[PDB]
Amino acid sequence: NIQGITKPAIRRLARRGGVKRISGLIYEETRGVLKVFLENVIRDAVTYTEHAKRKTVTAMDVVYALKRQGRTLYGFGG
Amino acid sequence: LRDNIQGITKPAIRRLARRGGVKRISGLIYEETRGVLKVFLENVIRDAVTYTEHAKRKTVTAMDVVYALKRQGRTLYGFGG
Amino acid sequence: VSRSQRAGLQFPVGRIHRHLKSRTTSHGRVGATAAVYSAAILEYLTAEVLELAGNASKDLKVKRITPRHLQLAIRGDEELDSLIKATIAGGGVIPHIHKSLI
Amino acid sequence: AVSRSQRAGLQFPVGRIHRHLKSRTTSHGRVGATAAVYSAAILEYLTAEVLELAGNASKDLKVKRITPRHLQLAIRGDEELDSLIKATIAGGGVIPHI
Amino acid sequence: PHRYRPGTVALREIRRYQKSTELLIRKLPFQRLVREIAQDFKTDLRFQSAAIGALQEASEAYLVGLFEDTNLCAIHAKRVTIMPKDIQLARRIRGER
Amino acid sequence: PHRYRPGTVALREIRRYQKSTELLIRKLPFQRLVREIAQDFKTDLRFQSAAIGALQEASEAYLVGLFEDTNLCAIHAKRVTIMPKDIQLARRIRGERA
Amino acid sequence: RKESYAIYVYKVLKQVHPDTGISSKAMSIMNSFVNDVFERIAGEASRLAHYNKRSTITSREIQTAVRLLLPGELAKHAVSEGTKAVTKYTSA
Amino acid sequence: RKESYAIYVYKVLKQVHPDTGISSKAMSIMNSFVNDVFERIAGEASRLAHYNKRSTITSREIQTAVRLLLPGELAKHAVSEGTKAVTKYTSA
DNA sequence: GTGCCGAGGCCGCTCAATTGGTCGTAGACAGCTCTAGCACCGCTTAAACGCACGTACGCGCTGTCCCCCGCGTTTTAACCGCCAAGGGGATTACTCCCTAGTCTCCAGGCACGTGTCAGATATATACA
DNA sequence: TGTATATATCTGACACGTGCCTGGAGACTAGGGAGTAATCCCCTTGGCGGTTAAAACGCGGGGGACAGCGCGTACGTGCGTTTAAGCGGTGCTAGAGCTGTCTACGACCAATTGAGCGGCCTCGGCAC
C-alpha cells in the first residue's frame, strides 16, 4: 500500500513549508522517509493496546505513543 | 573577574574542530564560536543556581551539574558519583 | 467558602491538591501550601495564551476563538515558542516566504 | 537463608530493586513480586551487552583493564546501541571518522 | 494563447495552503496504509474513527516541518530546487538518520 | 627548505586528537568564564573541584558534535572551509534558539 | 466522570476579553495545554524532594520548577503572581 | 550509606571475560547507565497503570515498557531472558 | 626496559535482605447492555494520471583576486607542588506546629435537553 | 486572468440553565517530616615563584572561494479525459465500557543472621 500518496499530494505538502521548485525524485524519497517515521508510531500504538487486552486501537493510544517520540499533538484528549 | 570572554584562544578552537572532521577553518569562526558557546553555557549554569538555592546552599556541588544537564538533553556520565 | 475565592484565583484548589497526592510519591506529602502556588501558575499561563490569541481575532472581525489564531499567537511569539513545543491540530504553520524565491 | 537472586539465576539484587520501586511510583500503589524478578533481568542483560562489545575491542590493544575509550567505541560504533544510549561518556572521545 | 511564467503559478500556492487549516493528504489512501503496517505486528486489528484523524495530523505536521529545514539547505548551497540528498542531511542533524 | 604542502599537515591532527581522550580546552581560562556568568544570577558563589570538570566535559562534547553537522553542510554546498553562516543552519534543525 | 477544565478556561477569557468566544475544536487545544504543564510541574517538583532528601512538598518546590521549565522572561512574572495568592489565602 | 552497583557489575564481567578488569573511571560509566535505565523503566511503567485505571505494577508492566523504549531487535531477546527467571523463581 | 599510585582481595561492623503469620481490598473474569467499527449498495463531480513544448535551474570549465596554511623568533601566562586561614557542607540531638486520615453536611461540577446567531456558501461588483 | 470585498443566505453547533450526585469544604485528634540551632573538621579560595607547555605577532605563497559565460536535459504550466475520492445512506455483530462477586497474592509488623559499605594494604597494570 505504498502507492497511497500520489504525486500532487506530496507537492501540496511542500507548498506549506516554503518549497518553490520540487524535483522529480522527491516523490520517490518522500515515501521512504514517511514510512520510517510511521513505523515508530504504529508499532508503539500496538504495544499500548495489547497491555489493556484490547483489539481496537482507541483515540488515546495515538496520543500516548506520540508523546515519547517528541511530536506531541493536541486536540485529541491530550 | 572582568571580561573573561577571551579565555578561548584561537588554537583552542582548532583542537575542537579536528575531532569532528574540519579541514580548513575560516578567520571569522573564532568570532562566532565564542558567541554560540556562551549561549549554551547560559542555560546549564543558570539551571545549576536554581537547584543549589533550593537546598539552602551556597556552593555548587557536583550533583547539580548532572541534574541540570539531564533536563536540557545532554546527559553526561561519569560524574554521577 | 471555597479555597479558590479566598486566594483570588479561578482554578480549583481542591482538584489540584487531590491530583498531586495521587501521583508521586507514597512517602511524599502535598500540603495545602503547595496547592495555592500550583493554581497560580496554571492560571497565568492560560491567560497569557488567550491574550495573544484574542488580539488577532479582532482583525478578521470574528467572535469565537478559532484554532488558526491559537497557532499564530503561540508560534509567532519568541517567548512562548520554546515553552509550547507541541503541535496544534488544524492550524498549519506561520506563512513565511524566503527572499530567494521571489 | 536463600537469596532471591540465586533462585532466579540472576546477579542483580532483587530486594534492592523491589525496595526502590515502592519509594518512586506510585502513591497509593503496590509493587508486585513478579515485577522485581523481571526488572533484574533487564538491567543484567543490558549490562552484559555493553561489556561484551567492549571486552572484545580491548583485547586487541594489548591492554587488560577496561579503559573509558573502549566503552565509547562499543556504544557509538553499534547502530542499535547508539539510539538507546543517547548520553555522553566523559573521557572517551568520538569515533575516528575521516 | 495565455501562459504564465514558470514561477508565478507555483508562488500563488504558497500563500493559499499556508492560510488554510484543512488536511492536504486524503483520508482513504492514508487509512489503507496504516492497516497494512499494523497487520505485521498484530493481525485482525481495528482502528477507531478518531484514531485515523490523530495519525493524519501528526504525519502532515512532520512532513511540513521537515520541508522547512530541507529547503534551507538548497538556498544555502546557491540553489532553488530541492534535492533528495538534502533530506538525509537535515535528518542527520536532528537525530533521525 | 622542507616546507610541506598546505593540506598534508592539517590531516594529521584528525587522526591524533580523535584517538586520545584528553581535555582540549584548558582549565584556568575556562574557570574564570563560569564565574562571570554565575555572578549575575547569585553573588558570592562557589564551585567544587568536581563541579568544574563536569561543566568542561559537557562543553567539549557540545562543540565537537556541533562541528560534525557543520562540516557536512560544506560538502553539500561544494565547499571545504567552514563558515559562520553554516553554524546557524545546523542549529535551526536541532531547535537551538538565538 | 470526565474531569476536565472546560468550565475554568472560559471564565478567565471573560475577565480579559469579554467580547470573545470559543469553539469545540479550540476547547481541546487549551485543555491539553493545561494538562501538559501540570504533568511537567508535578514531575519536576517530585525529583526535588528525592535529590535533596526530603518528602513534604510545599510552596518552595513549586517555585523552583517554574524558573527551570521557563527560559526566563516569563518566569519572573510568575513569581510575583504566585506569591500574591499565597499570602492572601493564609492572611484571611 | 552509598547504595551503588559497584559489586554487581564486576560479577557479570567475570562470567563472560574473566581475563579482563575494570577501573574507577569505567565504573562510573556503567553505574550511571543502569541508574538511567531504571529511571526510564519505572517511569514508563507508571503511566501504563494510571492511563488504564490500575494501581498494581506486576510483570506485565515491565515487559510492556521494554518494547516501547528499545527500538526493536534487542527488545525481542529481552523477552526470552526476562521470562526465564520469572518461571524459575515461582516454580522452585 | 624503568618507577609510582590505583585496582583486586581480606577482615570487621551493623543496615536492611529474607521467613512466617494475619487479613485489607487490588484485580481475575463470570454475564449483560447497546456505542459506533467493518463491509458493500450507487450517483455526482473533485482531483489524479498521461503527455505537449518551450523556459530557465543545475551543471561543468576556468580566471584571478586575496582567502588563511605552514614554519619560526619572541612572548604571555598555564601546570606544577606546597603554604596558611576560615567559608559553609556534613551528620548529629530536640520539640514546634505541617498536614495525613475519619464521619458528616450540603454545594460545585457536569450529563442531557434546549433557543437562535457565529461564521460558512457562493452568488454580486471593483480592483491589484 | 488573477485574489479581496460586498450583502445576502443557510442550518450546524455555542451558550444558557435547570436536574441531581459525587467529592469540595470544615472541626477534630494522632504522630512523624524537617524547623533552625548546636557540633566537628571536609576540602574552597587566595597566597608565592620556580620551570617550560603552548599563546601571540609577523612572514611568504599555495590553493582555496565564488564572479560569470554558456552547453543541453529535467520539470513548470496547462488541455484533454482515466478511474477512484467522498457524499447520501442502510444492515450485521466485533469487542469498548459499566457494574457483580469473592478468591489470588501484596502491605504491615517483628524478631533472626547474612548481604555488602567503609577503611587497609600489596602488588602488578600500564604511564614515560
Author numbering:
A (entry chain B): 25 to 102
B (entry chain F): 22 to 102
C (entry chain G): 17 to 118
D (entry chain C): 16 to 113
E (entry chain A): 38 to 134
F (entry chain E): 38 to 135
G (entry chain H), H (entry chain D): 33 to 124
Task: Provide excerpts from the study.
Variant H3.3, along with H2A.Z, is notably enriched at promoter regions and is commonly associated with transcriptional activation. Nucleosomes containing both H2A.Z and H3.3 variants also exist in vivo, being primarily located downstream of the nucleosome-free regions of active promoters. Contrary to H2A.Z, H3.3 is different from the canonical H3 histone only in four or five amino acids. Recent studies, including ours, have revealed that the incorporation of H2A.Z increases the accessibility of entry/exit DNAs on nucleosomes.
Mono-nucleosomes were reconstituted following an standard protocol using recombinant proteins containing either canonical Xenopus histones, mouse histone variant H2A.Z.1, or human histone variant H3.3. To produce nucleosomes for the Cryo-EM experiments and the MNase digestion assay, 167 bp 601 DNA was used. We next performed single-particle cryo-EM on the H2A.Z-H3.3 double-variant nucleosome. 3D classification of the dataset shows all classes with asymmetric DNA ends. The final density map at a 3 Å resolution was calculated from the best class without imposing any symmetry. The model closely resembles our previous H2A.Z nucleosome structure, featuring DNA asymmetrically wrapped around the histone core. This asymmetric wrapping of the DNA is likely attributed to the asymmetry of the Widom 601 nucleosome-positioning sequence, as observed in other variant nucleosomes derived using the same synthetic DNA. The other four amino acid substitutions in variant H3.3 (A87, I89, G90, and S96) are part of the α2 helix, which adopts the same configuration as that in the canonical histone H3.1 from our previous H2A.Z nucleosome model. Notably, our MNase digestion assay reveals a small but significant difference between H2A.Z and double-variant nucleosomes, where DNA located at the internal sites shows greater protection in double-variant nucleosomes compared to in H2A.Z nucleosomes.
